[PDB]
Amino acid sequence: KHTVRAAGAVLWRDPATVEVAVIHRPRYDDWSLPKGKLDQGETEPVAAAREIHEETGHTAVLGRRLGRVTYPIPQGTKRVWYWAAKSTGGDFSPNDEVDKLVWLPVDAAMDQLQYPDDRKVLRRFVKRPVDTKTVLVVRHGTAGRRSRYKGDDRKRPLDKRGRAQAEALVAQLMAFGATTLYAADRVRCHQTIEPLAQELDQLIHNEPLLTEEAYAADHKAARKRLLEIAGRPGNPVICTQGKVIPGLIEWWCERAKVRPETTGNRKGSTWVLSLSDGELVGADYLSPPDEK
Numbered sequence: 001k002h003t004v005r006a007a008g009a010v011l012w013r014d015p016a017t018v019e020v021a022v023i024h025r026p027r028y029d030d031w032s033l034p035k036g037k038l039d040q041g042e043t044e045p046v047a048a049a050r051e052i053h054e055e056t057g058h059t060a061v062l063g064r065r066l067g068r069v070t071y072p073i074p075q076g077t078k079r080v081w082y083w084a085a086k087s088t089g090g091d092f093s094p095n096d097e098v099d100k101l102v103w104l105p106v107d108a109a110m111d112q113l114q115y116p117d118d119r120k121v122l123r124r125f126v127k128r129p130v131d132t133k134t135v136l137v138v139r140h141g142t143a144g145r146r147s148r149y150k151g152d153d154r155k156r157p158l159d160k161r162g163r164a165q166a167e168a169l170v171a172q173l174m175a176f177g178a179t180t181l182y183a184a185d186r187v188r189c190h191q192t193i194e195p196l197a198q199e200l201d202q203l204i205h206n207e208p209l210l211t212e213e214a215y216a217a218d219h220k221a222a223r224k225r226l227l228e229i230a231g232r233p234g235n236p237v238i239c240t241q242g243k244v245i246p247g248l249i250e251w252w253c254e255r256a257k258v259r260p261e262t263t264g265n266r267k268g269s270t271w272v273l274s275l276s277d278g279e280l281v282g283a284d285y286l287s288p289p290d291e292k
């Protein structure tokens with residue numbers, strides 16, 4: 001019942017002109033997908049990108065999540081979450097840890113991959129488009145407790161934990177190539193993405209239509225705004241509140257017939273919404289960075 005957490009990827013480059021990376025490890029004499037264990041304090045996406053780079057030499061942008069693999073190891077259970085990862089370049093160099101890397105079309109990769117569960121992940125990869133754009137919907141970080149007053153507490157700030165969540169989110173949102181920033185009209189939403197804003201040197205666009213009060217008064221306007229943001233070029237981060245996110249995510253998944261594999265709505269959590277030709281093809285719920 002102890003889980004060793006890991007992550008990795010189907011690393012790909014230019015549906016069926018695509019080539020994917022398969023690695024060989026001398027220690028096990030295996031052919032598999034690049035992946036590795038999370039370091040203390042890392043989230044799965046951050047670890048996937050790091051391990052891809054360490055094992056293949058490539059940087060990449062993570063897209064759609066492609067499922068979970070588990071198997072027994074002496075310490076308990078190895079758990080690996082996999083992403084589609086588009087190469088943004090690099091060069092492999094053989095070493096003692098990974099001695100070969102082959103770029104293969106999917107059919108040939110299917111034969112090269114020795115583990116059934118890697119083949120399962122690769123089947124998931126080909127099931128939907130992988131050249132995706134990404135919308136990142138983030139519930140703001142922890143911000144103490146609502147006051148006894150009516151409504152919201154417009155200026156209530158992140159607490160110490162929440163400020164740490166905000167800092168931890170930078171690496172997680174960068175893993176997906178976030179480029180533009182949007183926050184509902186509450187201090188705690190802006191503060192969650194301020195560290196990212198500082199990192200990108202971008203301003204945060206204020207969104208009065210996406211607050212809890214606004215969604216409860218005019219949900220259609222909130223939905224319309226979400227779609228307007230998502231249609232703009234780049235990969236937007238939109239930080240908003242707990243009474244808003246589940247309704248927006250459910251409505252989009254329903255209209256697009258997308259089934260999320262995981263669900264939740266925790267403060268500091270992220271939904272990764274993958275779009276292909278402006279249609280939703282994936283909705284992946286990530287835990288807060290300091291939670292499992």
Ligand SMILES: Nc1nc2c([nH]c(=O)n2[C@@H]2O[C@H](COP(=O)(O)OP(=O)(O)OP(=O)(O)O)[C@@H](O)[C@H]2O)c(=O)[nH]1
Nearest residue numbers: 006028030032033035036037069071073078115117118
């Ligand atoms: N890469 C990989 N290895 C697996 C899978 N299933 C499975 O039994 N193995 C075996 O699990 C054992 C431990 O390998 P591992 O790759 O999980 O562990 P690791 O800590 O050395 O590497 P990591 O840092 O990449 O997680 C190896 O004997 C390997 O053959 C799988 O789906 N993928």
Ligand SMILES: Nc1nc2c([nH]c(=O)n2[C@@H]2O[C@H](COP(=O)(O)O)[C@@H](O)[C@H]2O)c(=O)[nH]1
Nearest residue numbers: 024028029030031032110111112113114115
């Ligand atoms: N190197 C290696 N390859 C294995 C194994 N099992 C296993 O099924 N294979 C498959 O055998 C083929 C590669 O053989 P080599 O060229 O000898 O590395 C690939 O289809 C692998 O998926 C194994 O333990 N080692």
Ligand SMILES: [Mg+2]
Nearest residue numbers: 034035036037
């Ligand atoms: Mg590894």
